[PDB]
Amino acid sequence: LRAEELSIQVSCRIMGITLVSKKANQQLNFTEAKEACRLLGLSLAGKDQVETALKASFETCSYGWVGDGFVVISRISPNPKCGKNGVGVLIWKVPVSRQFAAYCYNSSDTWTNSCIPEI
Ligand SMILES: *[C@@H]1O[C@H](CO)[C@@H](O)[C@H](O)[C@H]1NC(C)=O
Ligand SMILES: *[C@@H]1O[C@H](CO)[C@@H](O)[C@H](O)[C@H]1NC(C)=O
Ligand SMILES: *[C@@H]1O[C@H](CO)[C@@H](O)[C@H](O)[C@H]1NC(C)=O
C-alpha cells in the first residue's frame, strides 16, 4: 500500500477521527486499513473512539475498519442506505479480508472539531 493511493475523506476531524479510503476501485482490508492510518501518522481508531466522535456529531455513510477487528458506521440521522436506517455507531462483523474504508484517530487533536478553535 502506497500513501499516494489514499483519500482523506474528512478534513475537519471530530474528536480526532477521520475517514480514509482508497482512490481505486478496491478498498482496504483490515491489515491495509491499519497501514493506511500508519502511513498518515495516525492509528486505526477503536469503536469507542468513533462513539466519542459521534457524540460530537461525526457522521459517515461508509463502513470502515476499527482496531477492534470489525467495521462500523457512524450515524446521526436514519438513512436506509447507511447502516440500515439506524443511528449510533453500528457494528458489522466481516472477514478481515473484506475491503472497506478506515477510521483513523489523531491523538494530537485537542479540539472537538479540528477546524474550530476551542478553549
Ligand atoms: C467542523 O467544522 C467545519 C468547519 O466549519 C464544519 O463545516 C463542520 O460541519 C464541523 N463539523 C462538526 C461535526 O461540527
Ligand atoms: C490484505 O491485503 C493485502 C494486500 O495489500 C494482502 O497481502 C493481505 O494478505 C490481505 N489480508 C487478508 C486477511 O486477506
Ligand atoms: C493531528 O492534528 C494536528 C492538529 O491538531 C496536526 O497538526 C497533525 O498533523 C495531525 N496528525 C498528524 C500525524 O499529522
Curated annotation (Swiss-Prot):
Source species, domain of life: Eukaryota
Glycosylation-annotated residues: 29, 106
Cellular localisation: Cell membrane
Tissue: Mainly expressed in endothelial cells lining lymphatic vessels.
Disulfide bonds: 37-104, 61-82
Link domain segment(s): 16-106
UniProt modification remark: O-glycosylated.
Assembly description: Homodimer; disulfide-linked. Interacts with PDGFB and IGFBP3. Forms a transient ternary complex with PDGFB and PDGFRB in TGN.
Function recorded in the entry: Ligand-specific transporter trafficking between intracellular organelles (TGN) and the plasma membrane. Plays a role in autocrine regulation of cell growth mediated by growth regulators containing cell surface retention sequence binding (CRS). May act as a hyaluronan (HA) transporter, either mediating its uptake for catabolism within lymphatic endothelial cells themselves, or its transport into the lumen of afferent lymphatic vessels for subsequent re-uptake and degradation in lymph nodes.
Protein name (Swiss-Prot/TrEMBL): Lymphatic vessel endothelial hyaluronic acid receptor 1
Source species: Homo sapiens (Human)
Residues of the full protein shown: 25 to 143 of 322
